[PDB]
């Protein structure tokens, strides 16, 4: 059945002005943007969201980047969306993503990998709540 | 000059999931999405926004479903957004313009766009706080 997952278009993608194309990959895969907003995270906001990695070697560098510029945080909804959005995205590391994946077409380095998406139902619920209030989401 | 303008992707376009295609239109035209949010407009919100004004029809459509409100920035953005959208009525908009390509009627014309400098500032400020617009 249908589900909702969190997707972030990251600073690097935002700065390349490729929001439309990426957004079209989602839409044309059958997923619908049911909640979205552009913003710039703060040191604290980035750290809250990525708390899971709070003691890994790239945490400091990740926070830096996810806060370095604006992003489009958004909720994608559709049939089996969590798994779907992962298929669209490709490997976290761009040099491993099959051709045609957002991460392979729009990014070079794992630092600046274009997009984020949730990896499970449990993190999908957590992440959506982090950035959106239920009344903000306009299921359609 | 580098101006800003208000853009809305109206319910009809959002309903058919073409947010990508229209967004790519602006970006490729040289415009930049410098602030955005999806949201369902309430009665007052729509009436509030359409302050300088069939009215009951406009309001009715503009609230029939979710929309994406946003600020576009870049050289001559206000009129470029206009030349891009095409004529307000799609039954007359030149081929290629957003409205001809996505729009059915003048009642559901896919997009909206600050019609002037004075209308832009008003329109932008109504939906967005300055701190939600991050130029680049």
Automatic annotation (TrEMBL), chain B:
Gene Ontology terms: biological process: CTP biosynthetic process; GTP biosynthetic process; UTP biosynthetic process
Location (main, coarse): cytoplasm
Residue span, Nucleoside diphosphate kinase-like domain: 2-135
Cofactor: Mg(2+)
Residues spanning the membrane: none
Protein origin, superkingdom: Bacteria
UniProt-annotated binding residues for ATP: 10, 54, 82, 88, 99, 109
The keyword DNA-binding is assigned to this record: no
Compartments reported by the entry: Cytoplasm
Sorted UniProt keywords: ATP-binding, Cytoplasm, Kinase, Magnesium, Metal-binding, Nucleotide metabolism, Nucleotide-binding, Phosphoprotein, Transferase
GO molecular function (one): metal ion binding
Residues forming the catalytic site: 112
Primary enzyme class: transferase
GO CC field: cytoplasm
Alphabetical list of PROSITE patterns matching this protein: NDPK, NDPK_LIKE
This enzyme's EC code(s): 2.7.4.6
Nucleotide-binding recorded as keyword: yes
Catalytic activity: a ribonucleoside 5'-diphosphate + ATP = a ribonucleoside 5'-triphosphate + ADP; a 2'-deoxyribonucleoside 5'-diphosphate + ATP = a 2'-deoxyribonucleoside 5'-triphosphate + ADP
Family (UniProt): Belongs to the NDK family.
Function: Major role in the synthesis of nucleoside triphosphates other than ATP. The ATP gamma phosphate is transferred to the NDP beta phosphate via a ping-pong mechanism, using a phosphorylated active-site intermediate.
Subunit architecture: Homotetramer.
NCBIfam families: PRK00668.1
Identification of the protein by name: Nucleoside diphosphate kinase
Species name: Halomonas sp. #593
Gene encoding the protein: ndk
